[PDB]
Amino acid sequence: YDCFRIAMLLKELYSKTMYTVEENFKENGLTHQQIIVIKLVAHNQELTISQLCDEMSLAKGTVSGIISRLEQIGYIEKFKKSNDKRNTYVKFTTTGFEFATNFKIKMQESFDDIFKNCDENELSDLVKNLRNILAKVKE
Amino acid sequence: MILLKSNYDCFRIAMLLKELYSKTMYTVEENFKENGLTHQQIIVIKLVAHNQELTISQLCDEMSLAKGTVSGIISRLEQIGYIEKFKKSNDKRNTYVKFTTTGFEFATNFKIKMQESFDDIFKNCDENELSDLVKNLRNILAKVKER
DNA sequence: ATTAGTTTGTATGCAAACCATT
DNA sequence: AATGGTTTGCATACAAACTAAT
Ligand SMILES: [K+]
Numbered sequence: 619y620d621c622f623r624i625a626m627l628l629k630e631l632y633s634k635t636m637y638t639v640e641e642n643f644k645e646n647g648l649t650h651q652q653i654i655v656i657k658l659v660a661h662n663q664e665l666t667i668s669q670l671c672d673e674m675s676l677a678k679g680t681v682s683g684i685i686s687r688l689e690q691i692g693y694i695e696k697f698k699k700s701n702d703k704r705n706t707y708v709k710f711t712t713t714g715f716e717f718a719t720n721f722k723i724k725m726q727e728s729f730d731d732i733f734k735n736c737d738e739n740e741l742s743d744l745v746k747n748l749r750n751i752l753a754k755v756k757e
Numbered sequence: 758m759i760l761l762k763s764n765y766d767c768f769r770i771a772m773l774l775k776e777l778y779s780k781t782m783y784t785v786e787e788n789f790k791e792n793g794l795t796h797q798q799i800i801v802i803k804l805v806a807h808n809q810e811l812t813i814s815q816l817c818d819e820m821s822l823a824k825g826t827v828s829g830i831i832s833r834l835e836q837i838g839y840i841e842k843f844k845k846s847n848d849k850r851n852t853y854v855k856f857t858t859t860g861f862e863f864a865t866n867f868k869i870k871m872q873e874s875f876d877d878i879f880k881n882c883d884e885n886e887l888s889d890l891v892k893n894l895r896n897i898l899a900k901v902k903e904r
Numbered sequence: 905a906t907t908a909g910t911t912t913g914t915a916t917g918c919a920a921a922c923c924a925t926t
Numbered sequence: 927a928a929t930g931g932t933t934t935g936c937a938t939a940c941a942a943a944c945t946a947a948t
Binding site for chain 2: 620624625626627628635673722732736747748751752755
Binding site: 795822823825830849850851 | 919926
């Protein structure tokens with residue numbers, strides 16, 4: 619099995635989902651990654667940069683960059699906890715909350731309308747494989 | 758009072774895709790960090806080696822990237838000297854890439870290492886599971902490529 | 905010593921804008 | 927004019943190397 623053809627095959631699906639998300643949110647000045655972050659905070663309230671990394675399958679140095687550039691935009695806020703002043707935490711600002719709320723539906727539909735012509739079975743059958751192989755790959 | 762139409766979580770599908778994608782390509786970068794080549798430069802080389810010559814538009818289709826992105830990757834990879842850009846007299850807009858001698862020697866020595874760098878990620882993964890992966894990828898990909 | 909983060913350097917991710925060719 | 931490509935101006939990809947803080 620030519621796992622190159624397999625890689626490029628993901629490359630294709632992956633590319634198409636994320637840059638669709640870019641298009642849908644081009645009007646609001648957000649990258650697909652920004653949108654990924656906002657979707658992730660709006661679910662978890664606060665997150666360590668470290669958890670973001672895990673969640674977005676992304677290195678610390680990149681998440682670092684992204685969250686800062688979001689801070690400057692005034693959507694997220696970083697903070698440090700009294701007990702342990704190393705861990706940096708991320709949560710919404712007022713506008714952050716207001717955005718997530720106003721666009722909750724659009725963010726939800728960007729990803730969802732990508733696969734509309736698929737059936738739920740066809741979707742979950744993919745998720746099963748993904749989770750399966752993903753596990754096989756990890757050791 | 759809102760009635761938010763709940764559905765199926767395609768955000769989950771993106772993040773998993775992302776994870777499987779990420780681990781695959783950045784594994785390849787480490788595999789070729791000694792060699793001074795990014796995984797993108799390697800994908801190019803694997804394509805040029807298989808197809809002999811390719812136009813920038815053909816590369817976009819193969820790597821699923823945008824003309825400007827790929828224009829960059831080639832120009833930089835020409836600076837290292839593994840890749841010649843040329844134009845055919847019959848339509849001079851089109852720009853093709855193919856190997857230099859140096860880049861052809863590379864592609865020859867390191868074929869096996871490029872082949873096993875991808876295949877070793879799915880070493881622990883056996884045949885059914887891959888066929889399934891392809892099956893589902895190809896199918897869902899067909900449905901997204903409608904609108 | 906150690907771990908969480910941030911910075912730095914270089915290659916990219918894109919659309920839009922710009923250019924050569926048809 | 928209309929493409930195929932290239933440039934540009936950003937936000938990012940990582941890993942190393944630096945910086946707090948435990
Ligand atoms: K990038």
